[PDB]
Amino acid sequence: MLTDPIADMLTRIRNATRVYKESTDVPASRFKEEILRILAREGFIKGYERVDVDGKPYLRVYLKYGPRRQGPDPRPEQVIHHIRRISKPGRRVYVGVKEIPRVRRGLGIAILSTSKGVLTDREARKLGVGGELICEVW
Amino acid sequence: GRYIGPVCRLCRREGVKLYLKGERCYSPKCAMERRPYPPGQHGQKRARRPSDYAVRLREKQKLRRIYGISERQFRNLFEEASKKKGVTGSVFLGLLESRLDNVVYRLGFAVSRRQARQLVRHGHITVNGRRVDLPSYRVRPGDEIAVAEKSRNLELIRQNLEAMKGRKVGPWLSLDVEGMKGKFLRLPDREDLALPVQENLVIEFYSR
Amino acid sequence: VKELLEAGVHFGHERKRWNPKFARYIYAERNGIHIIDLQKTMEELERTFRFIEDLAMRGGTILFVGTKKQAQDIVRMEAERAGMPYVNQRWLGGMLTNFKTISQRVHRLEELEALFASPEIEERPKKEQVRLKHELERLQKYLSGFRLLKRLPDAIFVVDPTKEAIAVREARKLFIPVIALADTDSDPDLVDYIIPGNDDAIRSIQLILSRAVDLIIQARGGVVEPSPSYALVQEAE
Amino acid sequence: DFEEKMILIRRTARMQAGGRRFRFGALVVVGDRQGRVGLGFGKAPEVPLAVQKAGYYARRNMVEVPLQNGTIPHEIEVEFGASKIVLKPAAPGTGVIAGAVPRAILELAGVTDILTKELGSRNPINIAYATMEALRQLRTKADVERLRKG
RNA sequence: GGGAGCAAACCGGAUUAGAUACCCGGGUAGUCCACGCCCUAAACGAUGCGCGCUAGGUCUCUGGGUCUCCUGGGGGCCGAAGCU
RNA sequence: CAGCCGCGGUAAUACGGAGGGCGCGAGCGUUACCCGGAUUCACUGGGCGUAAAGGGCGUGUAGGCGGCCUGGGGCGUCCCAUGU
Ligand SMILES: [K+]
Ligand SMILES: [K+]
Ligand SMILES: [K+]
Ligand SMILES: [Mg+2]
Ligand SMILES: [Mg+2]
Ligand SMILES: [Mg+2]
Ligand SMILES: [Mg+2]
Ligand SMILES: [Mg+2]
Ligand SMILES: [Mg+2]
Ligand SMILES: [Mg+2]
Ligand SMILES: [Mg+2]
Ligand SMILES: [Mg+2]
Ligand SMILES: [Mg+2]
Ligand SMILES: [Mg+2]
Ligand SMILES: [Mg+2]
Ligand SMILES: [Mg+2]
Ligand SMILES: [Mg+2]
Ligand SMILES: [Mg+2]
Ligand SMILES: [Mg+2]
Ligand SMILES: [Mg+2]
Ligand SMILES: [Mg+2]
Ligand SMILES: [Mg+2]
Ligand SMILES: [Mg+2]
Ligand SMILES: [Mg+2]
Ligand SMILES: [Mg+2]
Ligand SMILES: [Mg+2]
Ligand SMILES: [Mg+2]
Ligand SMILES: [Mg+2]
């Protein structure tokens, strides 16, 4: 079994980029979707589509990178420089609004899920609600 | 108390022109003229390269030595400054220069940094009317820093207000010379100031 | 200019000793051998030639590299054909990278070269006059193409980027770009402007490389007068 | 033009038939003080001859530091050897709150107000070396924008 | 119980300054078996179990298929990214 | 002498003195004690192949942890009001 799907997606992504794949299948949840979705908003992937990989639903996640480089090691800059799961099964994590953290004195995100839905920090903040810190992506 | 010793010899220590004694640490005699090198058996001899500390330290001892004050006294207005809003460095200087034993050296009345001291202490000065015999008095902005018509009629006062005919006053003061008064207008500013010192480095010594 | 349908000289090389990064440039594997998709080749060729063109007409210089004796000569020739240095015998402990000094060679090549000819040739003992003829003889071997080189070169053109990779590796530490005729046995990544197809096999080294020279000369100041190098294809068969 | 500043200089000892065979090494920063910094490690027989060499290597390994008002865009932690360096950026009036190495790299970046911690190996060579690939790493609301853009 | 060969202890023989040892000729417990105890270890990959991910090449064991290729399971070398 | 490192077997900047020098200043120094440095107990924030560190293995009880879709409840969690 999996232990944390989320984790696992994020990782599957951390893993994929780090060697410049084009696009990786993660297997699909509604939640899972909602998260991917935000990466789009903020431009961390190039997006995702639902696919059926032998008859079981997944989520191809078309990652995105910087431009070919100059000098030894022509390897793109990462866009997704950092992705870390925060809440963890059997270590849950909750922020209320005054607590919601500020990611890279401002340059990336936290993803929270709130009773109002999967948001960014600046998203939940404005919207004025707190919740479960999922992850943390610059 | 305060220091009380070879001053135009610290003129010499930091290695930089220090104003403390007046006409003389002024008039080809404060030694940074005659022997710019530092006091003691090892004066001309080359020194090994200041340790990252040393500097940090000197630059403070400088600033202090300058305003004739004790580190105990010194720090307290530091602590104040960092606690206070806005660029710490400045406000230190801000407050330093807000000292009356300075407000008076600034405003001419006596030549020297130590003179405005023993002139305040011995009574001869007033602020707004009331007298103040405390060097450590924190002049705000509004304050008429005066001579006491009581000593007013004195040799050392005439002389030194007479030398102050013609000369100029820091932006943040109005040395009126008729009623021997003198206003203190707004808190001075790093930019407004003279100082032979790297205030940004003084801070750096107290991050210890 | 430019050429089409050169299946009749080249298509692809090397068996299953590949590099998966190359992966994309492969079409399918026939009888365990790999077979490049020239069609992609064509796209790059342009993107690449476009790059030669400009640096040609800028005034600027290519450096050619084959220490491969599988193509040791085509280089010397096609690089003589464009007034452009070549390296041939073996690449060298930092030719570009330590250049300053690999250059102090050419210096004491000239010094020796024209210290022959006539003047004072023999004002010195002889246990030492066939020793110098040796030091020079040697400079002759590998420095010959490295001669016309005076500053750093504004390109590098390689045949086997894997066989010389101490060349490639070098380029980049200095920010110089890399052209190469790289095939499957090699690392696409570290080539800037790539020619997919045969590290090996005269047939194709010729065709390709020589065209590259077509293009250096053409604009710059010359015309298209078939090269004396098709005549060392007929010397393998 | 440039300021040369040199953190440390050391004595590495070789061994030989008949005894010790000494040698020297130098750590150098070069600043413009305006976003350009250099790190040099300079070894050779003679101290001077070292710093010298350091210098030269310095100016070739150049790091272009996006300042932003005496300070850094956004915190980093960086991990060279098990030297770890923590950089966090501050309001003017803060100071150069670092030690030793990581200071006179920022000092010489023309940084003025920033906060540092070292954790792990204290070793300068690496603590400097880290500090660099720390800077080398920073990015700007701009720079970021540019990556994600669509 | 069993006891052929081996072999702690132990008897002798060499050997060395000594030789309570390496060498030698013997030899009891033991080593074997039943049943009960002991629970130790360089009990070692000196690496806890599980699930997911992330280039390859090569050699080997055993299995399936449209069989000098493909696909599964195990042991082994090199090696991408990465770690240290 | 000495906090640690390590100083003295007739050139000791380290012992004792003197000159000078640095720091502070009606104080200054020693002791002891608490935080700190010490991410050296690591929640923020550490480790366990060779540095200290995987349990001889397994079975399995408490406990911890849980795949995909829908619906109800609102214990966790979140927001606002309010009292304290
Ligand atoms: K025996
Ligand atoms: K540890
Ligand atoms: K179990
Ligand atoms: Mg402040
Ligand atoms: Mg580590
Ligand atoms: Mg340590
Ligand atoms: Mg350090
Ligand atoms: Mg028995
Ligand atoms: Mg026997
Ligand atoms: Mg015996
Ligand atoms: Mg079969
Ligand atoms: Mg296997
Ligand atoms: Mg294998
Ligand atoms: Mg590697
Ligand atoms: Mg003592
Ligand atoms: Mg003596
Ligand atoms: Mg001694
Ligand atoms: Mg001492
Ligand atoms: Mg002494
Ligand atoms: Mg602690
Ligand atoms: Mg151990
Ligand atoms: Mg084990
Ligand atoms: Mg163990
Ligand atoms: Mg259970
Ligand atoms: Mg669940
Ligand atoms: Mg529900
Ligand atoms: Mg419900
Ligand atoms: Mg509730």
Side-chain angles (χ1 to χ4, degrees), chain C residues 134-148:
Chain C
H134 233 18
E135 148 175 357
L136 181 130
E137 236 168 66
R138 184 227 229 131
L139 307 193
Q140 245 128 226
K141 218 204 193 35
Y142 356 97
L143 277 241
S144 88
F146 207 70
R147 233 254 240 54
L148 354 172

mmCIF file of all heavy atoms in Angstrom, chain C residues 134-148:
data_model
loop_
_atom_site.group_PDB
_atom_site.id
_atom_site.type_symbol
_atom_site.label_atom_id
_atom_site.label_comp_id
_atom_site.label_asym_id
_atom_site.label_seq_id
_atom_site.Cartn_x
_atom_site.Cartn_y
_atom_site.Cartn_z
ATOM 1 N N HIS C 134 64.805 16.898 -34.396
ATOM 2 C CA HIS C 134 63.862 15.975 -33.747
ATOM 3 C C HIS C 134 62.765 16.719 -32.967
ATOM 4 O O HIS C 134 61.575 16.471 -33.174
ATOM 5 C CB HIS C 134 64.606 15.001 -32.810
ATOM 6 C CG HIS C 134 64.301 13.550 -33.063
ATOM 7 N ND1 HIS C 134 63.737 13.096 -34.241
ATOM 8 C CD2 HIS C 134 64.498 12.450 -32.293
ATOM 9 C CE1 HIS C 134 63.598 11.780 -34.183
ATOM 10 N NE2 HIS C 134 64.052 11.365 -33.011
ATOM 11 N N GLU C 135 63.174 17.616 -32.068
ATOM 12 C CA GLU C 135 62.233 18.496 -31.379
ATOM 13 C C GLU C 135 61.259 19.136 -32.364
ATOM 14 O O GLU C 135 60.066 19.155 -32.127
ATOM 15 C CB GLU C 135 62.975 19.575 -30.593
ATOM 16 C CG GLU C 135 62.231 20.901 -30.509
ATOM 17 C CD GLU C 135 62.921 21.914 -29.618
ATOM 18 O OE1 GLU C 135 63.960 21.564 -29.005
ATOM 19 O OE2 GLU C 135 62.422 23.060 -29.523
ATOM 20 N N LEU C 136 61.784 19.639 -33.477
ATOM 21 C CA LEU C 136 60.966 20.269 -34.514
ATOM 22 C C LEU C 136 60.065 19.244 -35.203
ATOM 23 O O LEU C 136 58.836 19.358 -35.161
ATOM 24 C CB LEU C 136 61.864 20.968 -35.545
ATOM 25 C CG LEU C 136 61.194 21.709 -36.698
ATOM 26 C CD1 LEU C 136 61.762 23.084 -36.817
ATOM 27 C CD2 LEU C 136 61.369 20.949 -37.995
ATOM 28 N N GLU C 137 60.693 18.255 -35.844
ATOM 29 C CA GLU C 137 60.004 17.083 -36.394
ATOM 30 C C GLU C 137 58.750 16.748 -35.606
ATOM 31 O O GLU C 137 57.692 16.447 -36.186
ATOM 32 C CB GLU C 137 60.937 15.888 -36.339
ATOM 33 C CG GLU C 137 61.167 15.203 -37.659
ATOM 34 C CD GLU C 137 62.314 14.215 -37.583
ATOM 35 O OE1 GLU C 137 62.191 13.197 -36.846
ATOM 36 O OE2 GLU C 137 63.351 14.469 -38.240
ATOM 37 N N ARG C 138 58.895 16.776 -34.277
ATOM 38 C CA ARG C 138 57.839 16.410 -33.337
ATOM 39 C C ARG C 138 56.756 17.497 -33.293
ATOM 40 O O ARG C 138 55.573 17.215 -33.503
ATOM 41 C CB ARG C 138 58.446 16.172 -31.942
ATOM 42 C CG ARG C 138 57.481 15.692 -30.883
ATOM 43 C CD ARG C 138 57.607 16.449 -29.550
ATOM 44 N NE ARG C 138 57.702 15.545 -28.397
ATOM 45 C CZ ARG C 138 58.624 15.636 -27.433
ATOM 46 N NH1 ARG C 138 59.548 16.593 -27.471
ATOM 47 N NH2 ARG C 138 58.624 14.761 -26.430
ATOM 48 N N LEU C 139 57.168 18.743 -33.062
ATOM 49 C CA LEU C 139 56.232 19.852 -33.093
ATOM 50 C C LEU C 139 55.396 19.763 -34.364
ATOM 51 O O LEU C 139 54.184 19.903 -34.320
ATOM 52 C CB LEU C 139 56.961 21.202 -32.987
ATOM 53 C CG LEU C 139 57.953 21.465 -31.825
ATOM 54 C CD1 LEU C 139 58.292 22.914 -31.741
ATOM 55 C CD2 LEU C 139 57.473 20.973 -30.474
ATOM 56 N N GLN C 140 56.048 19.420 -35.473
ATOM 57 C CA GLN C 140 55.368 19.211 -36.761
ATOM 58 C C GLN C 140 54.167 18.280 -36.673
ATOM 59 O O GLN C 140 53.145 18.522 -37.308
ATOM 60 C CB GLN C 140 56.340 18.654 -37.793
ATOM 61 C CG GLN C 140 56.623 19.578 -38.955
ATOM 62 C CD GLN C 140 58.122 19.775 -39.183
ATOM 63 O OE1 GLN C 140 58.580 20.906 -39.375
ATOM 64 N NE2 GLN C 140 58.891 18.668 -39.149
ATOM 65 N N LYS C 141 54.312 17.194 -35.923
ATOM 66 C CA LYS C 141 53.335 16.108 -35.943
ATOM 67 C C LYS C 141 51.928 16.604 -35.590
ATOM 68 O O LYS C 141 51.019 16.540 -36.434
ATOM 69 C CB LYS C 141 53.768 14.969 -34.999
ATOM 70 C CG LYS C 141 53.470 13.535 -35.508
ATOM 71 C CD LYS C 141 53.363 12.522 -34.323
ATOM 72 C CE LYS C 141 53.379 11.068 -34.801
ATOM 73 N NZ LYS C 141 54.266 10.874 -35.999
ATOM 74 N N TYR C 142 51.763 17.127 -34.354
ATOM 75 C CA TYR C 142 50.417 17.463 -33.795
ATOM 76 C C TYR C 142 50.058 18.951 -33.854
ATOM 77 O O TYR C 142 48.881 19.300 -33.974
ATOM 78 C CB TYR C 142 50.250 16.975 -32.343
ATOM 79 C CG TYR C 142 51.409 16.171 -31.749
ATOM 80 C CD1 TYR C 142 52.383 16.795 -30.930
ATOM 81 C CD2 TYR C 142 51.477 14.770 -31.914
ATOM 82 C CE1 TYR C 142 53.416 16.051 -30.334
ATOM 83 C CE2 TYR C 142 52.506 14.017 -31.330
ATOM 84 C CZ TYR C 142 53.474 14.662 -30.544
ATOM 85 O OH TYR C 142 54.488 13.921 -29.974
ATOM 86 N N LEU C 143 51.077 19.810 -33.743
ATOM 87 C CA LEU C 143 50.903 21.265 -33.748
ATOM 88 C C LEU C 143 50.561 21.842 -35.138
ATOM 89 O O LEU C 143 50.203 23.010 -35.249
ATOM 90 C CB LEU C 143 52.167 21.952 -33.221
ATOM 91 C CG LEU C 143 52.421 22.123 -31.728
ATOM 92 C CD1 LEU C 143 52.519 23.582 -31.384
ATOM 93 C CD2 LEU C 143 51.370 21.453 -30.912
ATOM 94 N N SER C 144 50.691 21.028 -36.188
ATOM 95 C CA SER C 144 50.559 21.505 -37.580
ATOM 96 C C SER C 144 49.251 22.276 -37.863
ATOM 97 O O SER C 144 49.270 23.336 -38.519
ATOM 98 C CB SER C 144 50.727 20.344 -38.581
ATOM 99 O OG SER C 144 49.491 19.690 -38.854
ATOM 100 N N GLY C 145 48.126 21.738 -37.385
ATOM 101 C CA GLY C 145 46.840 22.394 -37.538
ATOM 102 C C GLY C 145 46.609 23.418 -36.461
ATOM 103 O O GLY C 145 45.885 24.380 -36.643
ATOM 104 N N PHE C 146 47.247 23.211 -35.330
ATOM 105 C CA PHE C 146 47.157 24.143 -34.232
ATOM 106 C C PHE C 146 48.020 25.380 -34.490
ATOM 107 O O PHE C 146 48.274 26.172 -33.586
ATOM 108 C CB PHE C 146 47.584 23.453 -32.936
ATOM 109 C CG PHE C 146 46.967 24.031 -31.715
ATOM 110 C CD1 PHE C 146 45.615 23.863 -31.460
ATOM 111 C CD2 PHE C 146 47.739 24.745 -30.809
ATOM 112 C CE1 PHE C 146 45.044 24.403 -30.328
ATOM 113 C CE2 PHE C 146 47.180 25.284 -29.683
ATOM 114 C CZ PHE C 146 45.831 25.114 -29.432
ATOM 115 N N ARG C 147 48.469 25.544 -35.726
ATOM 116 C CA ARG C 147 49.419 26.608 -36.040
ATOM 117 C C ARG C 147 48.719 27.935 -36.313
ATOM 118 O O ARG C 147 49.055 28.967 -35.708
ATOM 119 C CB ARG C 147 50.309 26.218 -37.231
ATOM 120 C CG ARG C 147 51.825 26.354 -36.952
ATOM 121 C CD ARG C 147 52.502 27.559 -37.639
ATOM 122 N NE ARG C 147 53.567 27.144 -38.550
ATOM 123 C CZ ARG C 147 53.419 26.258 -39.550
ATOM 124 N NH1 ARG C 147 52.233 25.678 -39.792
ATOM 125 N NH2 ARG C 147 54.458 25.960 -40.314
ATOM 126 N N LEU C 148 47.749 27.898 -37.229
ATOM 127 C CA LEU C 148 47.030 29.093 -37.672
ATOM 128 C C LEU C 148 46.193 29.671 -36.523
ATOM 129 O O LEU C 148 45.747 30.819 -36.576
ATOM 130 C CB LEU C 148 46.145 28.772 -38.903
ATOM 131 C CG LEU C 148 46.244 27.365 -39.568
ATOM 132 C CD1 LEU C 148 45.157 27.151 -40.656
ATOM 133 C CD2 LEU C 148 47.674 27.025 -40.126
#
